[PDB]
Amino acid sequence: TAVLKLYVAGNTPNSVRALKTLNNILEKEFKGVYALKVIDVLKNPQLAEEDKILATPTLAKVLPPPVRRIIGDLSNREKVLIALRLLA
Amino acid sequence: VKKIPTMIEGFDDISHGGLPQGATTLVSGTSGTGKTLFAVQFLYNGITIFNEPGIFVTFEESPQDIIKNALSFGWNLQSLIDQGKLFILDASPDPDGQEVAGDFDLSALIERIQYAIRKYKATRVSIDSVTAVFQQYDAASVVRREIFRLAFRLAQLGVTTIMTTEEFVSDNVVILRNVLEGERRRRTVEILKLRGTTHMKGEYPFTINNGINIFDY
Ligand SMILES: Nc1ncnc2c1ncn2[C@@H]1O[C@H](COP(=O)(O)OP(=O)(O)O)[C@@H](O)[C@H]1O
Structure with missing residues (x-):
């Protein structure tokens, strides 16, 4: 029931890649674990301001605290898999 | 070339x-x-x-x-x-x-x-x-490109910007210096270049009191 926020810039290629990759992971190797909320910083920059986001894409585990962050298009799958295990 | 007064x-x-x-x-x-x-x-x-x-x-x-x-x-x-x-x-x-x-x-x-x-x-x-910014990221190549992109966007929005530096390329550059002279501090400002416009050349002394106070020009 923990919450992930993915901060993307629209349909730019790093963000398209990151979202495809992450949906694949969360439907397979992490099937039950996280809730995913996607935040488009091109549409809602004010939310990037609130959450203090600089890099795009940014994956953040936001609930339960503490908040922990990974940046990048997640094309390094094993680093992402390892990172999500540790936040779970 | 229009200029914005600093009132410094x-x-x-x-x-x-x-x-x-x-x-x-x-x-x-x-x-x-x-x-x-x-x-x-x-x-x-x-x-x-x-x-x-x-x-x-x-x-x-x-x-x-x-x-x-x-x-x-x-x-x-x-x-x-x-x-x-x-x-x-x-x-x-x-x-x-x-x-x-x-x-x-x-x-x-x-x-x-x-x-x-x-x-x-x-x-x-x-x-x-x-x-x-560069110190924050082990990816100098990302940062360098993003500072340009930012400068480009700021300029299309019409704003006037100061970027400080201790990388970026500009045709407007101001140098600040602080020399130890015996046991006193000698601070100077130099306008190195200003976008195809006119300015006084060399270092001018300044002091810090309720702001930067430039003198002797
Ligand atoms: N109370 C003060 N009186 C006089 N000068 C001051 C005072 N507080 C700060 N300053 C000057 O303002 C300067 C800012 O310097 P600089 O290092 O170039 O920027 P930054 O703070 O970003 O590193 C300080 O280094 C200091 O010399």
Whole structure:
């Protein structure tokens, strides 16, 4: 029931890649674990301001605290898999 | 080439009118030379004298230190934040560091700055410091490209910008220096280049008292 926020810039290629990759992971190797909320910083920059986001894409585990962050298009799958295990 | 007055004592005189409007000026200098003071005073003077809102983008200092440090100069930045005329945009590093898992850029940062400019109707921006951004990321290539993209966007929005430096390429560059002379401090400012326009050449002395006070020109 923990919450992930993915901060993307629209349909730019790093963000398209990151979202495809992450949906694949969360439907397979992490099937039950996280809730995913996607935040488009091109549409809602004010939310990037609130959450203090600089890099795009940014994956953040936001609930339960503490908040922990990974940046990048997640094309390094094993680093992402390892990172999500540790936040779970 | 139109210029925006700084009202920093002496500066509009040695720069012949102030800073080139709608462009980035680089303020370069080692630690302790007054770069942050120049950046803050540009926005403060902007708001209090011309009613031009400012955005201070900080990549290193906490906004709480920027506020508390401006006090000794008689500048109440919290009042101008409460009034909606100044916004400090906190892009300082997160204490847990940056964990990389693929390619990225700094789109969110550039969209935040753009949003802030529109929300606050800002026409002056200070960024402090370009150097700190590079230190934040083991990806100099990403940062260098994003600073250009940012400068490009700021200029298309029409704002006038100071970027401080201790990388970036500019045709507007101001150098701050602080030399130890025996046991006294000799501070100088030099306008190195100003975008195909006219300015006084060489180092001029300044002092810090209620701002930067340039003299002997
Ligand atoms: N109370 C004060 N009186 C006189 N000068 C001050 C005072 N507080 C700060 N300053 C000057 O403002 C300078 C800002 O310098 P600089 O290092 O170039 O920017 P930054 O703070 O971003 O590193 C300080 O280094 C200091 O010399």
